[PDB]
Amino acid sequence: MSLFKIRMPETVAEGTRLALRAFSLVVAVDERGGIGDGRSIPWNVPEDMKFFRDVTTKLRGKNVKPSPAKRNAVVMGRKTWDSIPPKFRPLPGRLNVVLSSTLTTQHLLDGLPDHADSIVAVNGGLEQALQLLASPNYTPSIETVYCIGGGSVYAEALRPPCVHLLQAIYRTTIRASESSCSVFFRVPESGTEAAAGIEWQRETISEELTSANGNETKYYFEKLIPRNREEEQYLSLVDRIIREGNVKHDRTGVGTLSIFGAQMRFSLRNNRLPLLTTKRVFWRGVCEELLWFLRGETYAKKLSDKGVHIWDDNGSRAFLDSRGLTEYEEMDLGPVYGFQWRHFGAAYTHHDANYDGQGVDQIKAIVETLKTNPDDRRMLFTAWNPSALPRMALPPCHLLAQFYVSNGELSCMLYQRSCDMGLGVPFNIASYALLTILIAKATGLRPGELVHTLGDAHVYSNHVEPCNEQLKRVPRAFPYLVFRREREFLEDYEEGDMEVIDYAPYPPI
Amino acid sequence: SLFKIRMPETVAEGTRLALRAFSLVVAVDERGGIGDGRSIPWNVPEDMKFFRDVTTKLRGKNVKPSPAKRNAVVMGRKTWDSIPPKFRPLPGRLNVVLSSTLTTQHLLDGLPDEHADSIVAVNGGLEQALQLLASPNYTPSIETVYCIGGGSVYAEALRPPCVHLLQAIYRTTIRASESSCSVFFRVPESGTEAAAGIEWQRETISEELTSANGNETKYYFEKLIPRNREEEQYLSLVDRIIREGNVKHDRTGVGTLSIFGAQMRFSLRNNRLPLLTTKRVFWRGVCEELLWFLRGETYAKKLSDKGVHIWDDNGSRAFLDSRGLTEYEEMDLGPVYGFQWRHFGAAYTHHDANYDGQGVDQIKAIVETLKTNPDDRRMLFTAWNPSALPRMALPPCHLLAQFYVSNGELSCMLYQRSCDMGLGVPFNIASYALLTILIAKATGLRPGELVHTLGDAHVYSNHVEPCNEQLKRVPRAFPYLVFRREREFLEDYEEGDMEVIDYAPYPPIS
């Protein structure tokens, strides 16, 4: 069963090679927005120093010791490096990236010593640095990148192409003011040319604190984030369902609030992955299940074994019996999803039987069509097989997708009949994002947009309370998907082959 | 007979007698006053002329008004009384008078001595008059209906249920201020409460004119229409495609501007039929094809013999041969659309073969579920069959529909993979409007909403210039579907059974 597989083309890698790495930015400014005199930092505020060290050293997981394996990186201009006393450099617990056209890596090591490799020089600007940090050697070993700046470096961060990779701004405002500030830092206001389409929202602001520096200086911290309209689509819909939805009751008898017919878009460009930030999504499961679908797999134990239990309840003897499927071996789910994708209309017996070259192979057909006739409007697959329906543990929710090509980009539309806004929808968004990414790789195209179409969009009545809390969260920027390695056939791709980078969801509640 | 779907015994709880679409004609002062209770306070002959002309004239070239094809004017009794006996009835128009006292045989009399049968008394308000003018008796003869008023009639015209049938308002403003006016008329402004969710817009306004009554009385005309948000929604999509769409090319190699993924909604409530007004839709064709779909038919000759030729190219000996279908006889389209709806997955041989009981009857199941468990989330039928595809003349374009129930109303969603905005789309909107209306009747629910999902929504390159001219047009209101008779079985509906009322679309784009 090898000639029934999808062969990936020679241009599989350049499809999804990460051009630039996503970064955050950390800065201190006065009320006039000035950042320094061009070689030194004017003010002395120890509480800003503590914040700076903390935001740039600490890692996502709790109590995780920074190490070559997993650490943060700080990127700085040469003059900023010079402003730090040689005794305190390199900054401990972080990878020091220094921008200079006159100083090499080894050259920086001269200066003060006297460890491992905590210093790298880059001949170029911030783009070149983010480019280097995009390579396997730094992705995903380096968890978060911070631009600790220098005027010209901040200047480069705040304009294309870099500004579109800027995920957060951690700004300290010092309430002093003087002539001595020559270099400046200003965040572009919403809807201006300098903003290049981005709309900076305020995530948090601290109360005004006083600095114990002898000068009684006031200061405060702000975290700014780039407005995530895509996730707001989703949040809006949830809010509309609670406010205006109809009370319905699904098969069990559980209450639900329901709206009918809706549509959402998500950009897949430049490695961008629409994993929701207001509530963490179980990505590993998303990844494992799609690959399981793609393979035409119908044995749930293959997911259960890899620690993915989303199909556990639907695969039990108890449930299968209650669907009259009394002859299915436990975890055998019948001709569901993947089977219809790769073997449409094929007669089903048991999971472990051979189904090679049986039924219609819709995925393969689409892959072949995209490569030859990209303008084709029949490029779509479905899992809604009325004949097979009774033989399935469960009817498909996401039952149809159509692909579309424009300017060498692959868009895909998914139609979902029943969409649980709490769990299904976030999961399925990621799922079809991955599919579209993979299919694009398989056809030598770039990812485009994912369009989601919803039928009965519902929120569960007891979920209303949790959901209302989540509505008061401002969506954060989406993470990115990169591939550790490629594989010769499509069906050979494993979860470990790909990595989700810069995923910073909110905590549970 | 046997494998067909039996219609319910009754009309769905809440359904309504068909109401006619009307325009309102009025003369007001700047304070909004229309009269003193029993007469008009001012003398402005130029308004009399405008009133005669707007209510008398028909749509054609020089079509003399006759009992065969004419307009109607609905008025209150007091208004009738105010018109001096020697001018009743108003020539070239059906005169509909509202009165609980006076009958047809009462008003006539009334007049000098010698007689017109262009009069009918109605014992009820404007609603009853609009009901009456929707009768099989009146819908041939009566082309446009005018509300020429009386304060009480205008009031009724401006509130639900009547206000929703108001296609236009022809207001004459007389620039006198008169204290004695005790009866008033205000057109409610967009966004306000009295507007009741209607957005009134000025279509035209005359320059200020002076009357020749020898008082230099200033006056002006304006036409006010309700905004058709839903056709605006379609047009904006068309306009967005032209402005932002990508250049693409169909199978033949013809140019298109296209966009991917869009969604439109249309209301079907009380059998409102979203037939687009800015370019005439071929309704008869839409109707015949749908009933053809519902019956599970696959023989296009059944369609082309009813003078409906949409499937002609796709049915020819030459075309079937090119799709590899050397076995099908001319016009045998294979297991397409209707076949999949009523026999999903059945082996196909020929159009004339018996298919009873074979495959899956998706419609019959959907109908059944709606009747018993309407919160169900599996009430959808697909024509997209990957097994059957290569045996079809054409793969389905509109390929999936989901049903939904809420507040005793049946809504429906349509997925369409390829969307031509000029011809295919407005046609399909009407197809699924009708379907949802029929399925509602079949399951005893009243019609709800049609949601339309578009895949590859496109406009043809050559069709760009004509579209831009259409885009400049202001949308008129949507017509209504009236079933003039009923059937025992859903499959038994002929096109003749249903009448579309008040569909007045624009002439062909020049």
Ligand SMILES: NC(=O)c1ccc[n+]([C@@H]2O[C@H](COP(=O)([O-])OP(=O)(O)OC[C@H]3O[C@@H](n4cnc5c(N)ncnc54)[C@H](OP(=O)(O)O)[C@@H]3O)[C@@H](O)[C@H]2O)c1
């Ligand atoms: N307020 C704050 O928290 C904050 C933070 C950081 C820094 N600062 C202040 O900002 C001031 C320094 O600002 P600045 O803009 O003058 O200096 P800078 O950004 O720190 O350094 C600029 C240097 O970086 C290198 N560089 C920049 N772009 C390059 C490119 N495209 N290709 C190759 N090399 C490139 C060049 O070094 P080579 O000449 O060696 O090639 C250039 O001279 C200092 O006063 C510092 O204290 C303030």
Ligand SMILES: NC(=O)c1ccc[n+]([C@@H]2O[C@H](COP(=O)([O-])OP(=O)(O)OC[C@H]3O[C@@H](n4cnc5c(N)ncnc54)[C@H](OP(=O)(O)O)[C@@H]3O)[C@@H](O)[C@H]2O)c1
């Ligand atoms: N400026 C203009 O464009 C314009 C146009 C027309 C009229 N007007 C003026 O408006 C004034 C009259 O206004 P109005 O409201 O008092 O009179 P109206 O609307 O013309 O007539 C009211 C009468 O119509 C009948 N009617 C109305 N609703 C009915 C219902 N629901 N069921 C049964 N019968 C119904 C009743 O007659 P019965 O008592 O017999 O039952 C009622 O008394 C006059 O001054 C007239 O000149 C102005």
Ligand SMILES: COc1cc(NCc2ccc3[nH+]c(N)nc(N)c3c2C)cc(OC)c1OC
């Ligand atoms: C704490 O260690 C030190 C760090 C620095 N770096 C400059 C400096 C200071 C505050 C800062 N604060 C923020 N928010 N962001 C920065 N990018 C930042 C930088 C870049 C300079 C020092 O010498 C004055 C020093 O030793 C005290």
Ligand SMILES: COc1cc(NCc2ccc3[nH+]c(N)nc(N)c3c2C)cc(OC)c1OC
């Ligand atoms: C049609 O001829 C006549 C009509 C009327 N009816 C009142 C009247 C007057 C102006 C009007 N003007 C407009 N814009 N619309 C009307 N609805 C209207 C009506 C309803 C009264 C008449 O006697 C003075 C008369 O004979 C000249």
